[PDB]
RNA sequence: CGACGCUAGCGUC
RNA sequence: GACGCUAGCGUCG
């Protein structure tokens, strides 16, 4: 151990070090890494000769997947212990048994796990003798730990008595999800507990001095601030709206409406998910009549959200997105429908931009937020900001801002999402990988849970770090008031636990655990019967006929596909900007509409095994029925019921 | 393509 | 006290 610890380190580790399953709650930026390695290199340093140890180390992002991996083998090696890992690009044709057999410390996603698990070639988990899941929290409701655990409390509680492996979880804080006092709180903490079956948790209570000297709490600051006075931008564009949905009425005809709410998106959602079943006895003005309202609602879709990016940023910035808007449709061919839209838009255009550049308009958000960046670079011209927007239109507005505005000629901003002075940002998903220290954090427009708030403060672990909350809407203060308040009751009832004998609180656990058994099997729903018929799948913005049921097969009964002809007919093939790949498949095209004018997106188009295929999506088309006629919307494709037809090779 | 998590809004016993 | 839907955001096979 010549790395020089800290006692807080040893702290946390000693109860993992004596075998219990064990929870590590401790501020981000204690340094995980280290205790991981203490505690692995403790584990199976202590095995007889006879015996041998198999630990495996979870993180569910890359980057932090890769670090670990790194940093793993470099400490391990010297001793003796086979390093390795696997995750979604290393994990194809290799037989996962062997690598599993021949290491000693394995580095996975999750998600690998499950899918070995649920296929049987890993059998159980008594493989392993030591499981650490980074950023435990979520070993919640669906996500990938919970189904490894899930696993691993079946071989607990049924009578395969197998020698399970000692579970340790690492995270900044439990949550307590909606909990309202101590209480629920320590009920939902007992619960986690229970998901990962732990009998301990660890926290810094000798040595906290210690640990208050090396990561700091930022300040935290709240900017109350309220909506433009004056909206010329939104008179003229809700006069757009009436329009065009005036011309809803006008095919349409059917029917508290407000004019640039979530309200407003889910409703023209609503009206699109209603008219993709408008069936006539003529089907060739149908086609178009549906379709000239699909744009319609399309084009008030991307109308609304001008308006919001109006709200919260310039409103040049908006002008600019709706016309990238108009250069995007411009390219998807020329109807009618198109020229009239765009040149109601021309007449608008020129009082629209005389009222977007003029400094009569500035959106108060942006001047505070230009007034605190202003204060804290005069202050310290070496500070790193970072920024937190909510959508990612916001964060290229609010850079085009940055630049544009001449009063921070000192900023010099960076991107990410999914040198410097400055980074905008949406949201990063878990404390994260190493990054810079900011010593200014700035949430614009941001809602978030309680563990996000623990782990922000990770970017600011310095002493004298700030962070600032500016807001128009005094919902989201009082949002994170209640944040707040429940992070107290998390420490509050964490501590009242750690006060109980440990045999009160394991049986605790194991009856809590017996309990959510006996729900996730209840909970285990059949099968209904599956319709055998010829069924039509129409598109979405041309409703034209594209194939049948009988014409796809499912491949691993997730993605589905098509043979014959039929398809190759009514699709166009587009080389990909993003050539990803997932598990056995390589992405090469994303395939859409061949009808004119039509060019909605349909699927992709990927290399399996040996052939070429495209693999498309439900919630991309519409599927009416022969005796019926009547056509009925699906989003999910597992919700889709009928003869599941898997893919034969054999054609 | 598909699986999950977070948030806001809206619903069901 | 959970489930579902719509969307925004993020991650992963
Ligand atoms: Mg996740
Ligand atoms: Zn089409």
Same mark, same amino acid.
Request: aromatic share 10%.
């Given at each position: 151990?010549?790395?020089?610890?800290?006692?807080?380190?040893?702290?946390?580790?000693?109860?993992?070090?004596?075998?219990?399953?064990?929870?590590?709650?401790?501020?981000?930026?204690?340094?995980?890494?280290?205790?991981?390695?203490?505690?692995?290199?403790?584990?199976?340093?202590?095995?007889?000769?006879?015996?041998?140890?198999?630990?495996?180390?979870?993180?569910?992002? *890359?980057?932090?997947?890769?670090?670990?991996?790194?940093?793993?083998?470099?400490?391990?090696?010297?001793?003796?212990?086979?390093?390795?890992?696997?995750?979604?690009?290393?994990?194809?044709?290799?037989?996962?048994?062997?690598?599993?057999?021949?290491?000693?410390?394995? *580095?996975?996603?999750? &998600?690998?796990?499950?899918?070995?698990?649920?296929?049987?070639?890993?059998?159980?988990?008594?493989?392993?003798?030591?499981?650490?899941?980074?950023?435990?929290?979520?070993?919640?409701?669906?996500?990938?730990?919970?189904?490894?655990?899930?696993?691993?409390?079946?071989?607990?509680?049924?009578?395969?008595?197998?020698?399970?492996? !000692?579970?340790?979880?690492?995270?900044?804080?439990?949550?307590?999800?909606?909990?309202?006092?101590?209480?629920?709180?320590?009920?939902?903490?007992?619960?986690?507990?229970?998901?990962?079956?732990?009998?301990? *948790?660890?926290?810094?209570?000798?040595?906290?001095? +210690?640990?208050?000297?090396?990561?700091?709490?930022?300040?935290?600051?709240?900017?109350?601030?309220?909506?433009?006075?004056?909206?010329?931008?939104?008179?003229?564009?809700? &006069?757009?709206?009436?329009?065009?949905?005036?011309?809803?009425?006008?095919?349409?005809?059917?029917?508290?409406?407000?004019?640039?709410?979530?309200?407003?998106?889910?409703?023209?959602?609503?009206?699109?998910?209603?008219?993709?079943?408008? &069936?006539?006895?003529?089907?060739?003005?149908?086609?178009?009549?549906?379709?000239?309202?699909?744009?319609?609602?399309?084009?008030?879709?991307?109308?609304?959200?001008?308006?919001?990016?109006?709200?919260?940023?310039?409103?040049?910035?908006?002008?600019?997105?709706?016309?990238?808007?108009?250069?995007?449709?411009?390219?998807?061919?020329?109807?009618?429908?198109?020229?009239?839209?765009?040149?109601?838009?021309?007449?608008?255009?020129?009082?629209?931009?005389?009222?977007?550049?003029?400094?009569?308009?500035?959106?108060?958000?942006?001047?505070?937020?230009? @007034?605190?960046?202003?204060?804290?670079?005069?202050?310290?011209?070496?500070?790193?900001?970072?920024?937190?927007?909510?959508?990612?239109?916001?964060?290229?507005?609010?850079?085009?801002?940055?630049?544009?505005?001449?009063?921070?000629?000192?900023?010099?901003?960076?991107?990410?999402?999914?040198?410097?002075?400055?980074?905008?940002?949406?949201?990063?998903?878990?404390?994260?990988?190493?990054?810079?220290?900011?010593?200014?954090?700035?949430?614009?427009?941001?809602?978030?849970?309680?563990?996000?708030?623990?782990?922000?403060?990770?970017?600011?672990?310095?002493?004298?770090?700030?962070?600032?909350?500016?807001?128009?809407?005094?919902?989201?203060? +009082?949002?994170?008031?209640?944040?707040?308040?429940?992070?107290?009751?998390?420490?509050?009832?964490?501590?009242?636990?750690?006060?109980?004998?440990?045999?009160? @609180?394991?049986?605790?656990? =194991?009856?809590?655990?017996?309990?959510?058994?006996?729900?996730?099997?209840? !909970?285990?729903?059949?099968?209904?019967?599956?319709?055998? %018929?010829?069924?039509? =799948? =129409?598109?979405?913005?041309?409703?034209?006929?594209?194939?049948?049921?009988?014409?796809?097969?499912?491949? +691993?009964?997730?993605?589905?596909?098509?043979?014959?002809?039929?398809?190759?007919?009514?699709?166009?093939?587009?080389?990909?900007?993003?050539?990803?790949?997932?598990?056995?498949?390589?992405?090469?095209?994303?395939?859409?509409?061949?009808?004119?004018?039509?060019?909605?997106?349909?699927?992709?188009?990927?290399?399996?095994?040996?052939?070429?295929?495209?693999?498309?999506?439900?919630?991309?088309?519409?599927?009416?029925?022969?005796?019926?006629?009547?056509?009925?919307?699906?989003?999910?494709?597992?919700?889709?019921?009928? %003869?599941?037809?898997?893919?034969?090779?054999?054609?």
């Amino acid at each position: 151990s010549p790395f020089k610890p800290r006692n807080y380190q040893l702290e946390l580790a000693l109860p993992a070090m004596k075998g219990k399953n064990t929870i590590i709650c401790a501020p981000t930026g204690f340094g995980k890494t280290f205790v991981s390695l203490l505690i692995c290199e403790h584990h199976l340093k202590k095995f007889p000769q006879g015996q041998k140890g198999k630990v495996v180390f979870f993180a569910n992002q *890359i980057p932090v997947y890769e670090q670990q991996k790194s940093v793993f083998s470099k400490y391990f090696e010297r001793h003796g212990y086979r390093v390795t890992g696997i995750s979604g690009a290393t994990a194809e044709n290799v037989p996962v048994e062997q690598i599993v057999e021949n290491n000693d410390i394995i *580095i996975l996603t999750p &998600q690998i796990l499950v899918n070995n698990l649920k296929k049987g070639t890993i059998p159980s988990l008594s493989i392993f003798t030591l499981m650490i899941f980074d950023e435990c929290h979520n070993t919640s409701k669906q996500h990938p730990y919970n189904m490894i655990m899930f696993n691993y409390l079946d071989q607990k509680l049924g009578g395969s008595s197998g020698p399970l492996p !000692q579970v340790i979880g690492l995270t900044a804080s439990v949550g307590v999800g909606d909990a309202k006092n101590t209480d629920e709180a320590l009920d939902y903490i007992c619960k986690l507990c229970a998901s990962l079956d732990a009998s301990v *948790i660890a926290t810094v209570k000798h040595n906290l001095e +210690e640990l208050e000297q090396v990561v700091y709490k930022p300040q935290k600051f709240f900017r109350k601030v309220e909506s433009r006075i004056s909206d010329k931008f939104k008179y003229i564009i809700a &006069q757009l709206m009436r329009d065009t949905e005036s011309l809803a009425k006008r095919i349409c005809k059917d029917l508290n409406r407000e004019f640039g709410t979530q309200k407003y998106e889910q409703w023209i959602v609503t009206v699109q998910k209603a008219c993709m079943v408008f &069936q006539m006895p003529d089907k060739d003005e149908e086609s178009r009549i549906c379709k000239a309202l699909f744009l319609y609602t399309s084009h008030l879709r991307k109308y609304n959200d001008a308006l919001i990016i109006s709200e919260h940023a310039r409103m040049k910035d908006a002008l600019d997105y709706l016309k990238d808007f108009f250069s995007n449709v411009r390219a998807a061919g020329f109807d009618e429908i198109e020229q009239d839209l765009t040149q109601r838009f021309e007449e608008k255009l020129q009082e629209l931009e005389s009222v977007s550049r003029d400094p009569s308009n500035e959106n108060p958000k942006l001047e505070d937020l230009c @007034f605190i960046l202003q204060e804290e670079y005069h202050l310290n011209p070496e500070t790193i900001t970072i920024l937190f927007v909510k959508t990612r239109a916001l964060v290229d507005a609010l850079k085009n801002w940055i630049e544009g505005n001449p009063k921070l000629s000192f900023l010099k901003p960076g991107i990410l999402t999914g040198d410097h002075n400055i980074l905008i940002a949406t949201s990063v998903a878990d404390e994260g990988i190493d990054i810079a220290q900011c010593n200014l954090v700035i949430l614009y427009e941001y809602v978030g849970n309680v563990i996000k708030m623990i782990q922000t403060r990770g970017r600011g672990r310095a002493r004298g770090s700030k962070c600032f909350l500016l807001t128009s809407n005094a919902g989201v203060i +009082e949002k994170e008031q209640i944040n707040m308040y429940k992070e107290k009751m998390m420490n509050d009832s964490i501590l009242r636990l750690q006060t109980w004998d440990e045999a009160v @609180f394991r049986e605790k656990i =194991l009856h809590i655990q017996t309990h959510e058994k006996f729900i996730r099997d209840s !909970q285990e729903k059949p099968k209904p019967v599956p319709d055998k %018929e010829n069924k039509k =799948l =129409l598109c979405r913005k041309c409703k034209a006929l594209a194939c049948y049921t009988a014409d796809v097969r499912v491949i +691993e009964e997730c993605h589905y596909t098509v043979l014959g002809d039929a398809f190759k007919e009514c699709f166009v093939s587009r080389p990909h900007p993003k050539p990803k790949q997932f598990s056995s498949f390589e992405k090469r095209a994303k395939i859409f509409c061949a009808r004119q004018n039509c060019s909605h997106d349909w699927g992709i188009h990927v290399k399996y095994k040996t052939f070429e295929i495209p693999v498309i999506k439900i919630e991309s088309f519409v599927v009416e029925d022969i005796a019926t006629g009547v056509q009925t919307l699906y989003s999910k494709w597992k919700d889709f019921h009928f %003869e599941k037809i898997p893919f034969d090779p054999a054609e």
